[PDB]
Design a protein around this ligand. Structure first.
Ligand code: BO4
Length: 137
């Protein structure tokens, strides 16, 4: 990748800067770094999945959903976009949408699904049940 050697190095540098910010709970800075990384190289779903996580840590779930949906569109075989979508939907009180997203994680990963991925799916399913049970007039 000679033509985009500078572009890719810069996008990955920005990504790493955003990841350090995320580790330090500087979610505002992480978001700005991931946003610049996407501008430099907009074909990498990881940057959108990372930005979705930062938005969710700030309880900015509408923006997290948008970024997760972008990650899914850019790489539909990448499970993490669906995990980020499911977390944001779950936190928004949309557990049926979260369940579908976490189920897709399990379908993608198949027999390679981790116990944490299974727990995510089961948590969403439980929240569907809880939400129904809590209905009042
Ligand atoms: O547009 B909302 O995510 O239902 O508030």
């Amino acid at each position: 990748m000679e033509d985009d050697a500078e572009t890719k190095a810069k996008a990955e540098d920005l990504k790493m800067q955003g990841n350090k910010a995320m580790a330090n709970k500087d979610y505002e800075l992480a978001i700005n770094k991931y946003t610049e990384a996407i501008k430099v190289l907009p074909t990498n779903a990881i940057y959108y999945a990372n930005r979705a996580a930062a938005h969710s840590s700030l309880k900015e779930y509408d923006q997290a959903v948008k970024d997760a949906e972008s990650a899914i569109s850019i790489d539909p075989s990448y499970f993490r976009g669906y995990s980020r979508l499911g977390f944001a939907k779950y936190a928004q009180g949309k557990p049926e949408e979260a369940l579908e997203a976490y189920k897709k994680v399990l379908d993608i990963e198949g027999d390679n699904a981790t116990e944490a991925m299974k727990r995510d799916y089961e948590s969403a399913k439980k929240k569907v049940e809880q939400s129904l049970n809590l209905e009042k007039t």
